Design a protein around this ligand. Structure first.
Ligand SMILES: [Cl-]
Ligand SMILES: [Cl-]
Ligand SMILES: [Cl-]
Ligand SMILES: [Mg+2]
Ligand SMILES: [Mg+2]
Ligand code: NA
Ligand code: NA
Ligand code: NA
Length: 330
DNA sequence: CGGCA
DNA sequence: CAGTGCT
DNA sequence: GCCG
DNA sequence: GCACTG
């Protein structure tokens, strides 16, 4: 259980005794990430969380290696930072990295697109604006480049959730709407608003996206759509852009998912996160012959759907102590 | 060796 | 399909 | 990158 | 681990 972050309270990270190491490893992790070396970046991310939650400063190679998520290679970097006070590799990061980061912060452009733009000789967002072929999504991402990098005060997230909730409950008063993600984890600021909608009767959630989105469009609240498959009525998620009325308002990212009540606990767990919390819990489930998604906790395929009326039941079935949302902030 | 949700 | 983004 |  | 695009 010591190996599994989902088995531990994330508040362990608030007392980071190894910041002089993790702040340097994070620069490298991001460099690998924007260049597309996702599995190396993942190992760094896990090592960083292991160091942030360790109970004391790491002071020896043998100690480092004993920490789950720290291997020989990561231990060698820790020992270099201890003795020398710096990590040499930080002076030998590819020169493309700042531009690759700039480009991949465009919503809809990932590492593959950023690398292509870089190969084509683009170096600034002015180059992208004037010379790149953008997808519909990437054009919206570029238009809102600064705003999508800003976090909003949680009070604004509340107002956005209430806007969605009021529009939804106007045509079915029994709909349940809950803000998840970083909001539900109690953070003071939110990168976007994640709204989960369901109905306790098990059926009235169906078909509401069309009416809800059109209602939110009628009042001008939705300003741009990033992902919204509205043609066949099977839509599960909406990803888009909103802006509250009045002066001093920024465009904000809004994600909505509509789910059947029978999947409420698993959808709430998924959408509350954190992302690394979810990945940890899902990896653990695999070791127990199970698979965890936003739909269900199931047994391995030939599977059976296990009964999970509440988040606590998912924890229980995986042998984990329950964590309130604020303690899932990995 | 291969997954890493 | 490859690429992307959600947590 | 680290893990089993 | 899944739901999207083109
Ligand atoms: Cl590099
Ligand atoms: Cl009603
Ligand atoms: Cl619950
Ligand atoms: Mg969010
Ligand atoms: Mg979101
Ligand atoms: Na280790
Ligand atoms: Na991006
Ligand atoms: Na974010």
């Amino acid at each position: 259980l010591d190996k599994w972050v989902c088995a531990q309270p994330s508040s362990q990270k608030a007392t980071n005794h190894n910041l002089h190491i993790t702040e340097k490893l994070e620069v490298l992790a991001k460099a690998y990430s924007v260049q597309g070396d996702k599995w190396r970046a993942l190992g760094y991310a896990k090592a960083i969380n292991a160091l942030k939650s360790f109970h004391k400063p790491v002071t020896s190679y043998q100690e480092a290696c004993s920490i789950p998520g720290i291997g020989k290679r990561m231990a060698e970097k820790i020992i270099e930072i201890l003795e020398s006070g710096h990590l040499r590799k930080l002076d030998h990061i590819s020169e493309s990295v700042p531009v690759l980061e700039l480009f991949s912060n465009i919503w809809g452009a990932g590492t593959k697109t950023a690398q292509m733009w870089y190969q084509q000789g683009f170096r600034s967002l002015e180059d992208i604006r004037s010379q790149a072929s953008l997808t519909t999504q990437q054009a919206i991402g570029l238009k809102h480049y600064s705003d999508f990098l800003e976090r909003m005060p949680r009070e604004e997230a509340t107002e956005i959730e209430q806007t969605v909730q009021k529009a939804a409950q106007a045509f079915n008063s029994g709909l349940l709407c809950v803000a998840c993600g970083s909001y539900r984890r109690g953070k003071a600021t939110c990168g976007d608003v994640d709204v989960l909608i369901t109905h306790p009767d098990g059926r009235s959630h169906r078909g509401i996206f069309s009416r809800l989105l059109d209602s939110l469009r009628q009042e001008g609240f939705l300003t741009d759509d990033l992902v919204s498959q509205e043609e066949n009525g099977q839509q599960q998620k909406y990803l888009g852009v909103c802006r509250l009325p009045g002066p001093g308002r920024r465009h904000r990212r809004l994600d909505i998912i509509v789910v059947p009540y029978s999947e409420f606990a698993c959808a709430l767990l998924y959408f509350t996160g954190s992302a690394h919390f979810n990945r940890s819990m899902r990896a653990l489930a695999k070791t127990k012959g199970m698979s965890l998604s936003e739909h269900a906790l199931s047994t391995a395929v030939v599977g059976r759907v296990l009964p999970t009326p509440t988040e606590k039941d998912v924890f229980r079935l995986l042998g984990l102590p329950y964590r309130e949302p604020a303690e899932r902030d990995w």
